[PDB]
Design an enzyme around this catalytic site. Structure first.
Site, PDB file in Angstrom:
ATOM      1  N   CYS B 238       0.815  -1.212   0.000  1.00 51.20           N
ATOM      2  CA  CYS B 238       0.000   0.000   0.000  1.00 51.20           C
ATOM      3  C   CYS B 238       0.853   1.269   0.000  1.00 51.20           C
ATOM      4  O   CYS B 238       0.600   2.195  -0.777  1.00 51.20           O
ATOM      5  CB  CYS B 238      -0.960   0.008   1.195  1.00 51.20           C
ATOM      6  SG  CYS B 238      -1.909   1.547   1.403  1.00 51.20           S
TER       7      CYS B 238
HETATM    8  N1  LIG Z   1      -5.484   6.277   6.012  1.00 54.08           N
HETATM    9  C1  LIG Z   1      -5.119   5.500   7.059  1.00 54.08           C
HETATM   10  N2  LIG Z   1      -4.987   6.014   8.309  1.00 54.08           N
HETATM   11  C2  LIG Z   1      -4.619   5.253   9.362  1.00 54.08           C
HETATM   12  N3  LIG Z   1      -4.363   3.931   9.261  1.00 54.08           N
HETATM   13  C3  LIG Z   1      -4.451   3.285   8.065  1.00 54.08           C
HETATM   14  C4  LIG Z   1      -4.847   4.050   6.868  1.00 54.08           C
HETATM   15  N4  LIG Z   1      -4.865   3.184   5.837  1.00 54.08           N
HETATM   16  C5  LIG Z   1      -4.514   1.966   6.327  1.00 54.08           C
HETATM   17  N5  LIG Z   1      -4.264   2.027   7.656  1.00 54.08           N
HETATM   18  C6  LIG Z   1      -3.858   0.896   8.533  1.00 54.08           C
HETATM   19  O1  LIG Z   1      -3.539  -0.275   7.773  1.00 54.08           O
HETATM   20  C7  LIG Z   1      -4.511  -1.291   8.016  1.00 54.08           C
HETATM   21  C8  LIG Z   1      -4.819  -2.027   6.727  1.00 54.08           C
HETATM   22  O2  LIG Z   1      -5.478  -1.124   5.841  1.00 54.08           O
HETATM   23  P1  LIG Z   1      -5.777  -1.524   4.312  1.00 54.08           P
HETATM   24  O3  LIG Z   1      -6.210  -2.971   4.368  1.00 54.08           O
HETATM   25  O4  LIG Z   1      -6.900  -0.581   3.951  1.00 54.08           O
HETATM   26  O5  LIG Z   1      -4.449  -1.254   3.642  1.00 54.08           O
HETATM   27  C9  LIG Z   1      -5.707  -0.525   8.541  1.00 54.08           C
HETATM   28  O6  LIG Z   1      -6.627  -1.339   9.248  1.00 54.08           O
HETATM   29  P2  LIG Z   1      -8.129  -0.856   9.554  1.00 54.08           P
HETATM   30  O7  LIG Z   1      -8.454   0.211   8.531  1.00 54.08           O
HETATM   31  O8  LIG Z   1      -8.970  -2.104   9.462  1.00 54.08           O
HETATM   32  O9  LIG Z   1      -8.014  -0.336  10.971  1.00 54.08           O
HETATM   33  C10 LIG Z   1      -5.051   0.536   9.388  1.00 54.08           C
HETATM   34  O10 LIG Z   1      -4.573   0.012  10.626  1.00 54.08           O
END
Ligand SMILES: Nc1ncnc2c1ncn2[C@@H]1O[C@H](COP(=O)(O)O)[C@@H](OP(=O)(O)O)[C@H]1O
Ligand SMILES: Nc1ncnc2c1ncn2[C@@H]1O[C@H](COP(=O)(O)O)[C@@H](OP(=O)(O)O)[C@H]1O
Lengths: 251, 252
Positions: B238
């Site tokens: 990501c």
């Molecule tokens: N914009 C954002 N702000 C804060 N945390 C984020 C975020 N995007 C992703 N994350 C973190 O990365 C995890 C996996 O996100 P993804 O699967 O969307 O990549 C998220 O779990 P949650 O969003 O279930 O708490 C969160 O902990």
């Protein structure tokens, strides 16, 4: 920011230390403190003289070891124990450690295998003539050598607040930086009534001398029995040198 | 041996990291992993994009807070979220944080208040023109700034092994030295079904888009729905956890 340097290159900040003592007081049982410690610390040992408190911890760790692991045991042989302490050790090794493919680690005063060896090296009746020097050679030095050689970062101790004197000022977690160890006192809040209750309920072996009045047991030459009204450690009479290490920071 | 330097002068050795991962596997519930983390780490927060997994953590933390306390919540507003993600953020704040005298921490790209500010700074459609520039300025930079400013040493994330791809190799605990944080993944061993079952059973507010097919929700421009036999995350491919590649910018 105060930081503490420990064995195995572990570092603890004051904030971590403070945080653990703040959170751990919220735990309801010693078993919970013990479970957390097991999960949290590598190089985790128990130190014991097979006092009743530490026997409770051994049994608690034994019950917890099915889910987790059994932390190894360190015993300092001062060479001046009651034989009854030593036979209890064998009983404890057989019951709790042999089944788990372990032996109790036994550390002795450097270069000595007996009381006569000790008296040959340092003179007769040293515990009468120089209690400090005796304390260092009999217990402090062997313990310090052990922490370093066995790569110990953290230890359970059998100390409790209700034991009084300097121990009423005890915290769940402490740092002994001179020894390079963290100390955990999981039965800090347990009374002697609680300790005995657990021993009896779980049929853990205990020192025969307890059936003869010895509520607290040290060396044969410096330990006397006590009646049910006196202080737990009144037959021992100053904090034992292994916990108060700074007075031997020179040697 | 390898030692990691976290924020707040905290130091973790490889032996500590390995020991935690080895013992935490023996725990039976996400709540136990969560309880342990609370007791173990100061400066503990939770990061969420309000994805389904992190919502379970929020509710779990809520129940645990009675005994312990409630770790603060961090949300990176990329300025390109779905509107209902922001609507969900409001519901969650009101339900879980307000009654505990908290607001959700919200971090946005530096010097930007809205999507229009971002577009006037770096140009329109930055994500399709320069994805490295976009990921950094919209997600990595604000997250990094938050860890530093809020003095965070440790975070709960909503990642799981069952989420497929690289997430298959996830550990319960991992370290991100560039951000100076430890990462805890308490629902690592849960399936989407288990996650959905807890959301349902405890009436936790979730993103409305999830009913419209969506299973993972990112930015509005880069998030597709998923079909029947497709992976839960096979709709947004990501950076926020792959901040390691932006090292030349972060090593200050
Ligand atoms: N914009 C954002 N702000 C804060 N945390 C984020 C975020 N995007 C992703 N994350 C973190 O990365 C995890 C996996 O996100 P993804 O699967 O969307 O990549 C998220 O779990 P949650 O969003 O279930 O708490 C969160 O902990
Ligand atoms: N000879 C020895 N070897 C190892 N540990 C010892 C020891 N003497 C004392 N200790 C540690 O200090 C605690 C206090 O002992 P005392 O009350 O005899 O002063 C012991 O608790 P236990 O012996 O109950 O495990 C043990 O943890």
């Amino acid at each position: 920011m105060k930081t503490y340097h420990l064995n195995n290159d572990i570092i603890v900040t004051q904030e971590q230390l403070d945080h653990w003592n703040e959170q751990l007081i919220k735990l309801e049982t010693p078993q919970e403190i013990i479970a957390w410690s097991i999960v949290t610390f590598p190089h985790l040992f128990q130190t014991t003289a097979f006092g009743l408190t530490g026997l409770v911890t051994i049994d608690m760790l034994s019950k917890l070891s099915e889910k987790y692991y059994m932390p190894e045991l360190l015993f300092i042989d001062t060479l001046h124990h009651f034989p009854q302490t030593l036979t209890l050790k064998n009983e404890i090794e057989k019951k709790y450690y042999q089944p788990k493919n372990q032996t109790i680690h036994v550390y002795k005063p450097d270069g000595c295998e007996s009381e006569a060896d000790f008296a040959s090296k340092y003179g007769d009746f040293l515990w009468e003539k120089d209690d400090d020097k005796y304390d260092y050679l009999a217990k402090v030095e062997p313990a310090h050598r052990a922490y370093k050689e066995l790569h110990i970062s953290a230890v359970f101790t059998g100390r409790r607040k209700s034991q009084g004197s300097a121990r009423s000022q005890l915290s769940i977690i402490e740092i002994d930086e001179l020894n390079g160890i963290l100390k955990i006192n999981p039965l800090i809040n347990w009374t002697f009534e609680q300790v005995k209750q657990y021993i009896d309920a779980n049929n853990v072996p205990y020192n025969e001398l307890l059936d003869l009045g010895y509520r607290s047991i040290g060396d044969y030459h410096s330990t006397q029995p006590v009646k049910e009204g006196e202080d737990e450690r009144a037959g021992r009479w100053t904090e034992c040198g292994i916990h108060e290490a700074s007075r031997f920071a020179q040697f």
